[PDB]
């Protein structure tokens, strides 16, 4: 539950928080102690209220996950580093080949411009807000890179 309620910049801020928070708002109601059940569980319990947004924010379910995942592999590490992994370039490079169908150095350069122009390449996913990812999500779409 604390991951769901986690706010940007907090220790428990994670991919689950980022994904759920943009499709709904979660709020704490009460705390339930382990004594309140028998046989007593080894973990504490809680009650939360989930309010799903109507209308659903019009962003692709896959694209939002795709960007969130690659940057949350190391949340406390810089976003630029998260894209330095070799497989991140390979999975992303083919995704660009898909865009052209309907170049490793180029996708390297394109990523460099996006992180530099958005001024997001030097911050950490654990300290980022919905808007920051959305701006990151755009800047890749403009340069033709789609995550998922």
């Amino acid at each position: 539950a604390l991951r769901l309620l986690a706010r940007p910049g907090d220790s428990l801020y994670c991919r689950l928080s980022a994904n759920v928070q943009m499709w709904a708002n979660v709020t704490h109601i009460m705390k339930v102690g382990k004594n309140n059940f028998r046989p007593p569980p080894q973990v504490e319990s809680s009650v939360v209220r989930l309010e799903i947004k109507n209308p659903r924010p019009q962003v692709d379910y896959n694209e939002w996950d795709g960007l969130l995942r690659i940057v949350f592999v190391r949340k406390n590490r810089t976003i630029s580093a998260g894209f330095k992994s070799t497989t991140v370039m390979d999975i992303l490079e083919k995704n660009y080949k898909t865009f052209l169908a309907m170049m490793h150095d180029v996708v390297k350069e394109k990523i460099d411009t996006v992180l530099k122009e958005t001024d997001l390449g030097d911050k950490r996913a654990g300290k980022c807000d919905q808007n920051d990812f959305l701006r990151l999500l755009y800047a890749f779409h403009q340069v033709g890179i789609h995550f998922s």
């Binding site: 924010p57 019009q58 962003v59 692709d60 896959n62 694209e63 996950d65 795709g66 995942r69 690659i70 592999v73 992994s85 070799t86 497989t87 991140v88 999975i91 083919k94 995704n95 898909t98 865009f99 919905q130 808007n131 959305l134 701006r135 999500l137 755009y138 779409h141 403009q142 789609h146 995550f147 998922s148």
Partner: peptide
């Protein structure tokens, strides 16, 4: 929020299917 509204509104201009796009789930395959 109003900044968010522009971005999400602008996102409509750049939207594409995901069918052939390989998800980032493949990231760990290496």
């Amino acid at each position: 929020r109003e900044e968010r509204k522009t971005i999400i509104g602008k996102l409509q201009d750049y939207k594409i299917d995901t069918s052939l796009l390989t998800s980032s789930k493949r990231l760990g395959e290496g």
